[PDB]
Amino acid sequence: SSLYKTFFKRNAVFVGTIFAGAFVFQTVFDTAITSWYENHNKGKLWKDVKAKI
Amino acid sequence: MAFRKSNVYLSLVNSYIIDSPQPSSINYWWNMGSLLGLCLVIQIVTGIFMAMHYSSNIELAFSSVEHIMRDVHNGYILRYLHANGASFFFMVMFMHMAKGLYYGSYRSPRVTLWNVGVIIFTLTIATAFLGYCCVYGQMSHWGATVITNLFSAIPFVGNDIVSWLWGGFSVSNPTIQRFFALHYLVPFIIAAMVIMHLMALHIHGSSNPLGITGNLDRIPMHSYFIFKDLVTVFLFMLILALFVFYSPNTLGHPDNYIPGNPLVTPASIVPEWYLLPFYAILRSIPDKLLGVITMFAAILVLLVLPFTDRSVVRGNTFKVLSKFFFFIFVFNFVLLGQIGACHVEVPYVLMGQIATFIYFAYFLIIVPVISTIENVLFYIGRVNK
Amino acid sequence: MAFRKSNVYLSLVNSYIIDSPQPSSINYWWNMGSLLGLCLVIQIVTGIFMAMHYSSNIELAFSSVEHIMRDVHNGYILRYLHANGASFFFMVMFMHMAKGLYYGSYRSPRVTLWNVGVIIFTLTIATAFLGYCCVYGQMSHWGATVITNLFSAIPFVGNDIVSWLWGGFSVSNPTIQRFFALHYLVPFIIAAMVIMHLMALHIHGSSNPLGITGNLDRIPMHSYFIFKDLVTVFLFMLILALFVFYSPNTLGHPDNYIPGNPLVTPASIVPEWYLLPFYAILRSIPDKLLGVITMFAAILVLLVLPFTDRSVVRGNTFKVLSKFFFFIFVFNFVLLGQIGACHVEVPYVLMGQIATFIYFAYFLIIVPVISTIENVLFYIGRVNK
Amino acid sequence: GPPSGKTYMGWWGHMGGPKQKGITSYAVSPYAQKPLQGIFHNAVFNSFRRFKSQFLYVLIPAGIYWYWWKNGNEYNEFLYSKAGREELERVNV
Amino acid sequence: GPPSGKTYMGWWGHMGGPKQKGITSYAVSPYAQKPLQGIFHNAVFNSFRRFKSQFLYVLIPAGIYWYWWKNGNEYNEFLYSKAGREELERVNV
Amino acid sequence: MTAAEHGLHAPAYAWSHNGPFETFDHASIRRGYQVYREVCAACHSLDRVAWRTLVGVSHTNEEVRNMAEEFEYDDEPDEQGNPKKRPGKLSDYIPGPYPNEQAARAANQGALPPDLSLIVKARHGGCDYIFSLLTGYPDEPPAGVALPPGSNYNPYFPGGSIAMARVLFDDMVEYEDGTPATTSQMAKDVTTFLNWCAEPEHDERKRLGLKTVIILSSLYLLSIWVKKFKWAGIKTRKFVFNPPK
Amino acid sequence: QSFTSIARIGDYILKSPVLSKLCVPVANQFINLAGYKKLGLKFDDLIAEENPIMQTALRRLPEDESYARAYRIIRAHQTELTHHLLPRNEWIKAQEDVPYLLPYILEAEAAAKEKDELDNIEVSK
Ligand code: HEC
Ligand code: HEC
């Protein structure tokens, strides 16, 4: 793929670049799941029952 | 020469994880070993971290665990991981042992490797029992009672060995507090036993599916099995993750959520799943002494294999009758466990006894007979004199 | 080839305790090594046995210890042995360290050996302090407090590391229960750390009092040093028995027989005798942070020794100026520990500061300056070119 | 370190196998190979050929046991039911 | 097993020393020797001479130190008594 | 073993929370607390559930503080060492109805009502069994079933004979949210509540489960693909033999 | 189990036309069912070699049979690790499936048997 050759240029991803990316993921990925999960369970959550009060 | 090679410490590693000569043809069954190693770590780590919240005291015991379950952040993950890890430890261990029987890993020069392995098996079953007691739920207390009482079968001193283990007139505070200490101790002894297991493995190398010499074609452990062990490592974790998060108590028993009670043994009392086949065997002999002797025998008879195996070739890959009977053995083991799970009722009792027979018969009669027959079958099938 | 040699497990035992080539001239200071091995066992065995009766719960902790003293059969023998065995461990450890420091064992190819040993020192002190907390007496509580607070000196994350360790607003139940947990764990690590100390020893063998090579005249470990070691083993047990039976509490602090109390630090608070010199060094610096940096430095400074000893020959046997300055260091060290048991009062503060200077100045100035002079002195005293 | 007992495995350079002569091996770099295929089209009909050979040593035993269990389990269910309570009393004690 | 780095100590038969020649040692069985005498008459006036040389190396440092301690120790004692409640108030803060 | 002894198998009801992606219905949990406080709490303890644990799950900080303060707990004696009481606080545990076991059995024909903190986990069937046991009390024992004095018949309980009578009856509770308090509508509620009581980590756990399974799944797949790449050289390898002269 | 033993039992069968006509078929089928020929291996290549006797034998084996055996074994491992079977035409045809190592084994066995006997021979005056 030419997308790899522009970003990393035929060199494996560096260990520093890995960790850096690893952090971003943690937050990004988490919020995504948390959201999908809360939404799917709408009406059951405490946030939702607290409003009907 | 390279540093990893010359250094005192690193070299031990290099020759066990990096340059270690492996047979090019070992399949995924050979991945069971590293998995057992991982289980030991998981168990040990999750354990030490829970010890920081546990109370050996017979009164505080069950509650402290429930304290780990509710108050300790991520506590439940630690408990559900320890608890399910134990069960997975046994699943993987049985598989590791099965791989041994099938591929004849026990014979050849690898006997000592096998014998040490058996010891480990005994040590693990012990460790797990001690740990199960620490929860001090109904299944805990009664299991503690029944199992320590196995020793009252010893002729004279028998009852003394028992009240000595208990440290009282029955399973009580002394017994739980001591079983916790012991539960902490044994795992380290196991680790120790594991290094010896590895040391014996290391002189003759691992075996392969063909059952012949590997010396003609080897590939370094590193940049091969490190990556291949990783495939099964990740899978192992995935499947465990599923239980730990989505089915945490399926492998357990409900009664162990009711504190222990000395005056009441639940009508639903049943051993942990991995102990059943053995529990089943003891239950089949209608005599106290014999039941316990026959049970321990069921474990020790594993030592007899490098001698009853009369074959002149190693492993089941090319033996027909062997494969078949090997599978009669495996399922019979499962049926044996299935039996331990049912009640002591008419259709099941006789079944348990027959299955028990088969079990012992495989090691002392089947294997030696079939192996001899197959030896000749091989000879007369191509010899023209 | 003999069996003790051919077996995978006995060959290890053989090359370490039976056939191991030793320098014929090694004196009794070389007996401290095995003594430490014994100590590790005494501590571990006694500990596990006591653990069967111990309760880490803060409300039960102190009393469970008395329960050991008052109700457990030979419980007092177990406790007094563990407690005194702890002090002997240090009296011996110090001697073992001194012998090496004198005979230049930290030099030549044995640096890694010495460096591993330094880790074991840091770890042993840690294990010891973890165990001292388990009695939860006045000294316990306050030792627990002060020491964990040593980390509140770290600039930014400070207090966070401290409350993390405590697992609460202060030293309470969580602290004592995780501390027992860890007091059980480290010993096994020390044990591991010891086998590495041994592996590092085993490639070059021990040195000897002459400080020269022992390759020309070797004598097997067995039947010489096995029996020579026995002499000190017994001698060691004889003195430990004198303390355990006739003077069990002389090496302790009375305040520890009073249950720990969070609202009152006794005006009689004093660290364990083996920690005093280090306590003293910390007190001698009127800055909070520098106080702990200097104290930790006083331990780390031992790693510097293989680089500051510029001598071209090993050991102090033939160096007039070194033997002198060595003892100046030894006694200085004792004076340091004496100042520690003293109060923070006028002549003692300044004394403590002068000695702290000397302590560090020994490894950094004296040794290099002195050894260079001795090298030259050795030269000009016989060169007539 | 002293010498230890002879084994059935050496190490690189002296693994202790038979003198090899005549065998010649060729191999290619993983970098120069098709970005992991083989799965489907070429080795899909090849896959599962194993356990089509072995499946009998596995099936026959499984069948023998699962049948034996089921059968024996039904007899249990019957004995403790109303109908069998007469036969139950016969074979029980 | 694989090789290891070169140490400065081998084992019996190749200890790693210089080639020896011309040295001849003689010894007698511990069984043919007098039932452990030595001490008293032969090795009683020989001992302690092995801490007569060294004695000055230990003693002086021990001396300098014990004097220093005992001395400033007396000064503390004085300072915290009536006789020195004035000297104390001076050299304290 | 005779079915009467095994007990009638509890059916599989459709719980709003059965499912790797499903959370409890906190709306039902709230109503559950009420069914417990007005009907169950007169015989059953909840010793393992601390007041604060309701805050943010079924009620509000104020509501809990208020439910707590209605009970008195032992406090440190005063100046002269006289034992004195105190209104409950968030850090406390829901008080039981009986001070001890002897007293509990006195008020129950000799029987002891288990603490319901882990009941859903201490029984095979869980929600399904607890719920079924609550609703399935037939007005009369089957023909031939002789019942011991003071006992009640219920097919779901093992042996059929159970010391607890029937307690759930239509409209016995007045639901705050206007929900019809039918005897089954309540059973559905208390059960859900009792489930949270025993498994408070619930929602949080299934969420982490989702993160874990996704990540590990990827690591697994990735790892297979990586292994194949490294092993490619060996897999495709070829040998040719020429018998030496 | 010894080959001296295997060869004893086997020949006796192979001699009496009753046992012969009855067993040889089962044996031929047992072997084709074994599947080793499908990996390009002869039975003798399967004999576990981690013992003095086999070690003695293998050394005494003429150079050419040895290099050949070497190849066969390697080939077996490469095929097995690829999870395939050798192309049908490369399978060892039963006529090639000869007990080439066997004579050496038996020689070595009986040689050992004697050494063993002569070490414990009693004397009678
Ligand atoms: C006192 C009169 C009670 C009231 C009101 C409720 N329960 Fe009860 N419960 C009581 C007794 C006497 C027992 C003992 C049963 C026995 O014979 O062992 C119980 C038991 C339960 C159980 C356990 C069932 C089991 O498997 O043993 C449950 C799940 C239970 N009780 C639930 C329950 C609920 C949710 C209630 C409020 C609607 C309730 N009980 C009220 C006595 C009394
Ligand atoms: C302190 C170190 C520690 C180690 C090491 C340890 N455990 Fe435990 N184990 C505990 C504690 C604490 C408990 C009690 C709390 C609990 O149930 O998790 C426990 C409980 C158990 C239980 C009860 C299961 C349950 O939770 O219901 C089993 C089984 C068990 N351990 C198995 C093992 C096995 C097998 C190993 C591996 C050798 C092991 N343990 C090692 C501390 C440890």
Ligand code: HEC
């Ligand atoms: C669990 C096993 C266990 C091990 C292993 C162990 N200890 Fe302990 N130790 C205890 C227990 C229990 C106590 C509390 C009872 C007591 O005071 O003796 C204790 C207390 C102590 C004390 C307090 C002294 C006192 O007042 O009694 C010291 C110091 C100590 N240990 C040192 C050590 C050292 C050093 C080691 C290892 C080299 C060690 N311990 C290993 C269990 C152990």
Ligand code: HEC
């Ligand atoms: C009695 C059975 C048995 C038990 C129990 C056992 N092993 Fe093994 N182990 C063996 C044998 C035999 C082999 C050699 C298998 C082969 O390669 O043919 C072996 C080999 C291994 C290997 C190499 C990988 C492999 O699977 O071949 C490792 C690593 C290993 N075991 C680790 C362990 C650990 C860790 C434990 C337990 C904590 C354990 N073993 C328990 C019998 C056992």
Ligand code: HEC
């Ligand atoms: C600060 C350093 C240091 C510490 C602490 C230390 N060692 Fe050593 N050890 C040495 C050195 C250096 C040698 C080599 C001295 C020589 O033989 O010339 C040595 C040698 C030994 C020997 C050989 C016998 C002897 O006394 O020369 C043994 C055994 C040994 N140590 C055991 C231990 C054990 C066990 C511990 C503690 C649990 C320990 N060591 C802690 C530095 C240390």
Ligand SMILES: C/C=C(C)/C=C/C=C/C(OC)[C@@H](C)[C@H](OC)[C@@H](C)CCc1oc2c(O)c(OC)cc(OC)c2c(=O)c1C
């Ligand atoms: C300090 C150490 C001590 C005192 C001793 C420990 C060693 C004992 C063992 O060997 C390791 C032991 C685990 C044994 O092995 C023979 C296993 C197969 C256990 C078999 C076993 O389990 C049961 C169990 O778990 C139960 O729970 C509810 C209940 C049980 O009755 C109903 C049993 C039982 O009837 C048997 C035979």
Ligand SMILES: C/C=C(C)/C=C/C=C/C(OC)[C@@H](C)[C@H](OC)[C@@H](C)CCc1oc2c(O)c(OC)cc(OC)c2c(=O)c1C
């Ligand atoms: C889980 C492990 C944890 C959190 C941390 C442990 C590691 C820390 C150490 O090193 C290993 C530590 C023991 C230290 O080392 C610098 C020793 C020399 C101790 C120095 C020490 O002791 C005291 C002591 O005992 C006391 O008793 C009542 C009282 C004390 O003042 C009142 C002290 C004290 O003022 C100091 C500096």
